[PDB]
């Protein structure tokens, strides 16, 4: 027993692929210390984090 199609169909299926995220950057002293020169001295004591 064999089943053979007679009339075909053509579909269009969408596909979703991310390619990139939102490019982001950050600065410690503005984030961590906030332009304060008292914290700017403390932060550098923690090495090159």
């Amino acid at each position: 027993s064999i089943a053979i199609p007679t009339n075909f169909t053509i579909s269009v299926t969408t596909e979703i692929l991310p390619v990139s995220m939102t490019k982001t950057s950050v600065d410690c002293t503005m984030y961590i210390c906030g332009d304060s020169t008292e914290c700017s001295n403390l932060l550098l004591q923690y090495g090159s984090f």
Partner: protein, 49 residues
């Protein structure tokens, strides 16, 4: 390279236009002082300290 932050131009200070002298002179130097358990809590307001 780094973060550019515009240096502040000058310093601006604003305080309420009140110049009443606080009664601390007689509060600390009061003649009679209460006991430890019956401490007389005093509220000071509307005066420059």
């Amino acid at each position: 390279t780094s973060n550019f932050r515009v240096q502040p131009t000058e310093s601006i200070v604003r305080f309420p236009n009140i110049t009443n002298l606080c009664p601390f002179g007689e509060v600390f130097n009061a003649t009679r002082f209460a006991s430890v358990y019956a401490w007389n809590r005093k509220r000071i307001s509307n005066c420059v300290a």
